Design a protein around this ligand. Sequence first.
Ligand code: SF4
Lengths: 270, 159, 92, 588
Amino acid sequence: VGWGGSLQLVADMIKMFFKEDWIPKFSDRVIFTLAPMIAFTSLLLAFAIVPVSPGWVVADLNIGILFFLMMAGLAVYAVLFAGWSSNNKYSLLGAMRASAQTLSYEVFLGLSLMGVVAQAGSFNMTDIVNSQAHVWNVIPQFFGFITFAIAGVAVCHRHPFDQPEAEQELADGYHIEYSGMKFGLFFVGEYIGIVTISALMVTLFFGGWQGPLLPPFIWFALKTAFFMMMFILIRASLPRPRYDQVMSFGWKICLPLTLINLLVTAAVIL
Amino acid sequence: NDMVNWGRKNSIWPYNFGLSCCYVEMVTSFTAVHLRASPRQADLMVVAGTCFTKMAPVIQRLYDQMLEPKWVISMGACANSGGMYDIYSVVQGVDKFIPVDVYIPGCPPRPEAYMQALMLLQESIGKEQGVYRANMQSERERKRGERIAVTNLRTPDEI
Amino acid sequence: AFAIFLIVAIGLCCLMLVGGWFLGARLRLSAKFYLVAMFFVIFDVEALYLFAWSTSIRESGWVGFVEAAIFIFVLLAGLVYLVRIGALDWTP
Amino acid sequence: PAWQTRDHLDDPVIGELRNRFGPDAFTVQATRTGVPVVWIKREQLLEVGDFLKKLPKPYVMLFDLHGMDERLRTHREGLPAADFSVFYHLISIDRNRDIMLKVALAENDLHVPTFTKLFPNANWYERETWDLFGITFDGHPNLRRIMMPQTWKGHPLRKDYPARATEFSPFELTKAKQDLEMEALTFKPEEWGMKRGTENEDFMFLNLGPNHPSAHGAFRIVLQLDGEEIVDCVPDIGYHHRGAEKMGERQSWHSYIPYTDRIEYLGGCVNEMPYVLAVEKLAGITVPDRVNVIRVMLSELFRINSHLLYISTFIQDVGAMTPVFFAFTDRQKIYDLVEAITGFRMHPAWFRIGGVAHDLPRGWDRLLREFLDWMPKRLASYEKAALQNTILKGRSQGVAAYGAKEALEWGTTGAGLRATGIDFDVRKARPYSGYENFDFEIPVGGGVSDCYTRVMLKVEELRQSLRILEQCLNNMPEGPFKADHPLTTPPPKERTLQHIETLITHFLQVSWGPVMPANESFQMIEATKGINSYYLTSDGSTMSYRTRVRTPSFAHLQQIPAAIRGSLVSDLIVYLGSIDFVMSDVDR
Ligand code: SF4
């Protein structure tokens, strides 16, 4: 039997390859093609700001945070041009409600990230990775960390569980009208999304490149693997939350939590 | 190279269209072998149950929706042919209007029959026409000397 | 650098798309109520002041925390206002 | 004997009807149904029904409405001259009695006044009569074809219509292109029911056909939407019509038995029990006690299986499905006992006319005892998991509730009807198969029928079934598994293999079929869902002349639009899940 977990994804990717592509009649063509890469390239270039190594840094630019937020905001357009390219009022309204809850739950990540970038005081990732030298920026900001966790798992990572189905009738999940390689593009996009959110979480909240007794790049890789396994454990444990309950525990509960988080960090930093 | 064939053997996506009856055994099979199956995404459609005259257009639209490489497994005697219901309201087999590749007799078939259907269907997918001059070998002919050599069976007054 | 990675990414996009080609009126009550997303459009602009704030806070000090508390208190008052009037509720 | 042909003319209802209407109109048939069958010209149907509805102990529930062809019956002693007939089976619960009314019709004037005004649930039944026969019911609100498509010419239950698909043209795809053209142009003519609302921007027409899981088969429920409200819901049923009733006319008494197993896929031997009971009532066969206890054992096992399936699916759809998936393994264990007895997991086809196919193998008692000691701890784990849970209990209260009167008028029987205050079981009112020597209770919900009441009642009935099954394990007596009578079909096989007269009886019984004398029988039982009955008419031949199968699920699915009117789509789906309906049962 197959001994590797990834070999299933390998066979799936091969399968999505070499599949005939059909043209949809009475449909726009540019957005039908462009909606996948707005979801794919965004979290692909979200990987361009990680300090994987001082000597093998992918990009030594001065600002990486704003690029991440720019991709976070851009991601919605993929669900919106997918909704309009569905050309079915059911599916279109399904993608409209999915983008609704998306914009609703994407609010929190910037305000949660303000705490760590304020105690870091810089946008260049070398300053953040040099800040976690003795004390990591996770002990004081428990609330900010969990709020960023909720926001990161809320961006089309299947935790809401309203993507391929709809709790509300008269509408349908927006992954139906794409069936060629674009569907494999969706899966690879969420895969690079989850691994890049995990990498950004480890390198921005915890301490990357520490190396207590072993070389620090494999220390980063193993810690990222532990957080990968914990993310998968809680994603599986997390049940599907209906649309209502998600709207109830959204803007009400975590906007005050992050506002008092900013108050706490601003009060303790001076 | 034939890597594409390995790709198609290794991974397949099943579209479960089981009807009123005969789907409880299919569920018994699916919950052991495996919300992933989605319309317009699968390349395998396991037609089970009695294909009724009224709902046959539904099966024809679902057949039209899937991509060019289409595989179909007929399960049960009610889907291979009309089965026991040779009546005005039952079509005499699903092969009348869609091409079929594998036929799984029974009423209802067993989950192990579904497992052997996946094994014979990856075996067929690994020899490419589609017949390829290899599918003339039949289970009637392959295990014939196995089945004829059977002499004794347990008496049916025991558990 | 970033430019090299961007060129690599766009070249991969061109390679996959070219390879793919070679491989071969009235809604009535439905929809509407996007105004939560409009609340996001305005609230992101509110939080953009905190986006600019978060870079320089050590030199800001006590009046900075004071007027940031006033700012988020105004936002909290507006939020509870929208909740209590019934604007922010169950939505289609 | 309890099978002898009686007229029931002495019954008090016969004398009350004789006093009110005097003489004439009434012809008292002689049958073995146990109930009074009366013929009533079509000009008195509404009078008779109205009088019976208000009679000092009224017939509150219309059990059945269907038609009979009757054209080819040579044995017609005592009946009036009829070329067609329509029968109406009514039941008085306060009398625990039934009455059957037959209206005779001639071939040139197939017209009868509609009965829906007294009992609304008759509407679809009359619609079926328009579909399967060609009787037009004047005064019917929506008289359309309910089983075949709207362009199907011919009435399939006429005897001049060829029964089998072979006599028609094969699937040449001549109709696939026309059905495709029709389906592509999906528009509403406003003929799908009343459709009071017009087709404009004000009202939206949505097929709303659930193809998702737990739907219990694929069906459509055309819905009119205004403000996301259920303005009018019209089900489109008949997709799973297999023509079982028509099939009954062209099969012998013995070879039809497999078809009974597929009226309800989950019922199994419960579906066979009424058929064998009716055939043995025609034969005049009294079975031994061992046959009775064996039949009770198999029926309580299948009933337990059905109750466990309903509980499992309900807890999974509106609650936490993590623990209850162990019941799936338990269902496999129940199956290993069934295929230990009968042979095959589903569709056992094990009951025979006069008995069962074989005796129990000698290791049956240890397996049943192991299942009976093992099950109660799991049953109490489900009892704590379901009585004490709060989330679904709070969610599942007052969700499209109705009362006793509402259940009575809509013909709804079973857990739905037991959820109201009417204490009516057939195993106590009309004991059959030796239930009268056992002690079990009928739980009842009070006056409100909802999902919590239904599951609590189903658990209590499962406990009573387990008490019956242990009493069957501890008091199984000794003796034969087949009655001693020339019409016991088949004979004991060891006797067939050695004795010439038994071999000849077996030869003609399995080849031409047993000759049952011309008479009409009728049996109803408590099924896994509601009350299921079989009305069989024989013309003296080896095949049934008319087979009528009353399934309660048809009524349960017909009732939803009356109660769910004024609710959301989510409440609709929850109600559809709650109601005990299976598509195979609705379309027979
Ligand atoms: S094959 Fe058997 S179980 Fe399946 S639908 Fe036909 S009769 Fe029912």
